[PDB]
Amino acid sequence: SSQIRQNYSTEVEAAVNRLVNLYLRASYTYLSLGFYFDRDDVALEGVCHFFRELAEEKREGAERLLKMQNQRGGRALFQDLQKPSQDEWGTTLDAMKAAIVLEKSLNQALLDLHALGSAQADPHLCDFLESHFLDEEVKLIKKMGDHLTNIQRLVGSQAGLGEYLFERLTLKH
Amino acid sequence: SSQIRQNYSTEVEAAVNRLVNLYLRASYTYLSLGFYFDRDDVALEGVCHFFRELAEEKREGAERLLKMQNQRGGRALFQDLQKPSQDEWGTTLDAMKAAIVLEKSLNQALLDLHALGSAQADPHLCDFLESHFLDEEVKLIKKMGDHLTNIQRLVGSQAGLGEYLFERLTLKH
Amino acid sequence: SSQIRQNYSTEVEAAVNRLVNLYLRASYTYLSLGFYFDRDDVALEGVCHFFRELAEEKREGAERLLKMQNQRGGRALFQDLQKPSQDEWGTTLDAMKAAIVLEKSLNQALLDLHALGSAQADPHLCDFLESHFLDEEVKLIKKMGDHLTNIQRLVGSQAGLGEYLFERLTLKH
Amino acid sequence: SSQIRQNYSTEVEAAVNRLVNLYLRASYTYLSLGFYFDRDDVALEGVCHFFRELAEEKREGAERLLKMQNQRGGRALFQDLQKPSQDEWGTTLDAMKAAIVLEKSLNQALLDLHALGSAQADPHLCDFLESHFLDEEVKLIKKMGDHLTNIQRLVGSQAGLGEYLFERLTLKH
Ligand SMILES: [Cl-]
Ligand SMILES: [Cl-]
Ligand SMILES: [Cl-]
Ligand SMILES: [Cl-]
Ligand SMILES: [Cl-]
Ligand SMILES: [Cl-]
Ligand SMILES: [Cl-]
Ligand SMILES: [Cl-]
Ligand SMILES: [Cl-]
Ligand SMILES: [Cl-]
Ligand SMILES: [Cl-]
Ligand SMILES: [Cl-]
Numbered sequence: 001s002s003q004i005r006q007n008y009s010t011e012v013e014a015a016v017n018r019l020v021n022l023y024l025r026a027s028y029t030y031l032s033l034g035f036y037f038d039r040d041d042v043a044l045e046g047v048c049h050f051f052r053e054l055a056e057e058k059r060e061g062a063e064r065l066l067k068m069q070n071q072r073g074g075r076a077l078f079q080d081l082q083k084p085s086q087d088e089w090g091t092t093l094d095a096m097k098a099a100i101v102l103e104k105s106l107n108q109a110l111l112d113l114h115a116l117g118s119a120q121a122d123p124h125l126c127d128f129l130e131s132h133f134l135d136e137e138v139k140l141i142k143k144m145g146d147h148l149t150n151i152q153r154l155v156g157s158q159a160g161l162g163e164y165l166f167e168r169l170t171l172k173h
Numbered sequence: 174s175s176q177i178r179q180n181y182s183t184e185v186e187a188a189v190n191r192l193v194n195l196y197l198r199a200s201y202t203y204l205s206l207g208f209y210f211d212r213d214d215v216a217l218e219g220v221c222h223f224f225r226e227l228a229e230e231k232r233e234g235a236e237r238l239l240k241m242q243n244q245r246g247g248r249a250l251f252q253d254l255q256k257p258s259q260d261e262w263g264t265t266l267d268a269m270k271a272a273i274v275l276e277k278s279l280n281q282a283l284l285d286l287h288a289l290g291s292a293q294a295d296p297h298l299c300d301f302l303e304s305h306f307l308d309e310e311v312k313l314i315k316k317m318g319d320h321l322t323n324i325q326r327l328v329g330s331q332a333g334l335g336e337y338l339f340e341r342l343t344l345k346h
Numbered sequence: 347s348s349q350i351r352q353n354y355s356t357e358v359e360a361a362v363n364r365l366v367n368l369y370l371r372a373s374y375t376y377l378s379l380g381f382y383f384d385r386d387d388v389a390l391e392g393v394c395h396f397f398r399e400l401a402e403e404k405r406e407g408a409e410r411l412l413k414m415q416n417q418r419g420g421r422a423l424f425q426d427l428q429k430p431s432q433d434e435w436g437t438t439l440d441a442m443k444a445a446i447v448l449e450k451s452l453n454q455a456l457l458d459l460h461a462l463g464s465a466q467a468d469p470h471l472c473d474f475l476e477s478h479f480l481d482e483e484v485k486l487i488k489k490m491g492d493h494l495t496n497i498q499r500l501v502g503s504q505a506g507l508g509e510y511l512f513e514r515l516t517l518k519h
Numbered sequence: 520s521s522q523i524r525q526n527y528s529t530e531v532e533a534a535v536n537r538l539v540n541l542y543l544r545a546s547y548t549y550l551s552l553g554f555y556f557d558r559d560d561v562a563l564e565g566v567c568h569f570f571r572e573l574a575e576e577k578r579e580g581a582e583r584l585l586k587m588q589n590q591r592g593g594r595a596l597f598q599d600l601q602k603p604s605q606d607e608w609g610t611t612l613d614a615m616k617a618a619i620v621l622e623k624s625l626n627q628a629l630l631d632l633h634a635l636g637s638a639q640a641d642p643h644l645c646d647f648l649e650s651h652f653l654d655e656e657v658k659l660i661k662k663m664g665d666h667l668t669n670i671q672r673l674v675g676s677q678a679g680l681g682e683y684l685f686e687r688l689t690l691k692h
Contacts, residue, residue, distance in 0.1 A: 004386050004664035006623055007630055028370075031412075032424050038416045040318035040350050059405075066377075070384045071661045078378050081427035123633045124657055127649035161330035161338070164323060168342040277352055284353055287469045303473035311470055315417045318350035386664035507676035507684070510669060514688040 002073030013074040023062035029084040030055035046171025175246030186247040196235035202257040203228035219344025348419030359420040369408035375430040376401035392517025521592030532593040542581035548603040549574035565690025
């Protein structure tokens with residue numbers, strides 16, 4: 001093992017590699033979400049831009065994990081990326097539910113890794129997660145919950161019109 | 174024939190003149206679309222501006238074909254311009270369908286002319302179409318499809334209100 | 347199929363989806379190349395930055411294919427992304443050979459798709475490839491060949507010192 | 520004890536004083552490293568500047584610990600500073616190994632103090648270490664590992680020439 005590696009367990013190393021995979025899979029899911037909303041028969045540009053920016057954020061998350069892995073003297077291992085769970089994502093409401101579910105799985109993986117670092121007495125790992133991932137997920141998920149609430153309120157009224165209004169007046173375009 | 178004319182078939186020359194006519198007819202259709210939406214009893218300014226800008230684009234297309242015709246040593250021939258297929262264009266939805274149909278006819282004429290240039294081994298013609306017309310039509314038609322989808326979604330909900338919202342929140346004014 | 351789709355064969359649609367997959371796989375290969383060179387026991391920063399920028403370029407390629415797919419009225423389908431062919435990439439020389447091999451596979455897939463568009467008389471497809479992919483690959487591959495030559499010349503002399511000099515004096519850091 | 524002191528154990532107080540001593544000793548080691556490389560018969564200016572900047576960083580570390588000690592109502596106690604372990608530091612490679620060893624001892628003392636704060640339920644201490652010391656050491660040690668790798672690769676080739684190239688092309692001067 002590495003000349004620099006110190007207080008860095010194999011359990012944490014491997015879990016960091018799994019987390020990289022989860023983040024790249026999320027990024028890929030968000031790419032598929034974004035381009036679904038760009039279809040001519042869906043055509044909600046602000047929704048497309050929302051999911052494409054999330055694709056970027058998740059890729060950046062992964063990259064940040066990989067940088068850390070190298071900083072600790074671990075070794076990055078890449079595995080196959082599973083395709084997104086759906087080919088078509090339904091309405092804005094369906095999509096935003098799927099996104100929240102996804103984020104909550106990432107958040108749980110983050111919390112599991114934190115618990116691992118704590119069990120291994122790896123405070124650098126814990127600090128790294130706290131500083132760059134945990135707060136960001138909480139803020140993201142809150143934002144998604146808020147969006148969901150606003151979508152629900154809109155489409156309960158009139159589904160088509162509601163979706164158009166959300167995209168125009170809440171989402172960036 | 175011309176001192177400069179080289180690898181420029183009469184078949185292509187004539188088809189370029191027909192394409193100029195199609196483009197000027199489209200321009201004229203779009204003028205009629207634009208001013209319909211400016212009527213006091215229709216009064217959707219953003220729709221009027223959308224179709225007037227398309228009138229301009231099609232005129233520019235024609236002008237660009239005529240410039241090319243002269244560059245190749247062909248001779249521009251003008252024929253009568255047929256009036257637009259309708260005097261009244263119905264709703265925003267009806268209008269946007271009519272526009273897509275029109276664009277798809279232009280696009281097909283572009284593809285037919287490209288196939289002609291290829292059969293005649295006229296790579297300058299093909300390149301000219303590729304560079305200035307084919308990509309532009311594809312982008313336009315996609316934009317129109319997107320608009321149509323958004324109009325459909327809006328007016329399925331409530332026809333009058335939907336149309337007003339589209340014009341205010343998607344179209345430039 | 348789509349309201350906008352015109353002269354867009356299912357053969358081309360499917361091949362565009364396969365090309366997206368190839369590009370995202372290349373992007374992922376380049377991510378693994380980049381982070382290998384960031385390991386404490388490899389530590390060639392300019393090499394890492396070279397491969398990370400290529401990761402970005404390939405992702406952008408894919409995104410550009412997906413945008414086009416939607417513009418034509420095709421439907422994006424995502425499949426599993428295969429992990430990179432190696433976990434460790436050897437020397438700068440080995441890595442640059444692997445990269446050239448990869449680029450040449452992309453280039454061949456581009457040429458195959460071009461031949462398909464030509465057989466299907468899809469000039470928009472051909473133009474799209476010509477404009478955004480074919481020239482870029484040729485330029486890239488030439489650059490990689492040049493790098494390879496310079497690496498070979500350097501490491502034939504003294505392997506370690508040569509590699510350090512290439513990274514410092516040719517690569518950006 | 521102090522009017523302000525709260526949740527601040529004597530065990531932590533004393534360990535903070537020992538850490539100040541370790542940091543000032545490291546600073547002094549780095550002063551000796553820096554000036555060795557400034558000798559007329561060694562004359563590697565970039566190496567001298569690298570170690571002098573590290574001397575400064577370690578002094579700043581100590582100062583930051585002392586500030587914190589006072590903030591918590593502890594009392595700073597100074598002890599003798601042991602001279603550096605060597606009077607002459609050999610090659611750039613030998614020096615960089617010695618530096619990594621030193622940093623890893625500081626890092627271990629940081630981790631031990633963190634474990635102490637955790638055992639004492641002193642979250643302010645833990646946070647203080649996480650925020651200002653743990654990440655910084657990890658980044659430093661990674662940088663030193665990278666340097667070591669590059670030095671090794673260079674001097675395996677030709678010792679004198681390699682050392683000169685590292686100093687000129689990697690180190691700041
Ligand atoms: Cl372990
Ligand atoms: Cl799967
Ligand atoms: Cl913590
Ligand atoms: Cl002829
Ligand atoms: Cl008529
Ligand atoms: Cl051509
Ligand atoms: Cl077909
Ligand atoms: Cl595989
Ligand atoms: Cl072509
Ligand atoms: Cl106590
Ligand atoms: Cl001593
Ligand atoms: Cl903490």
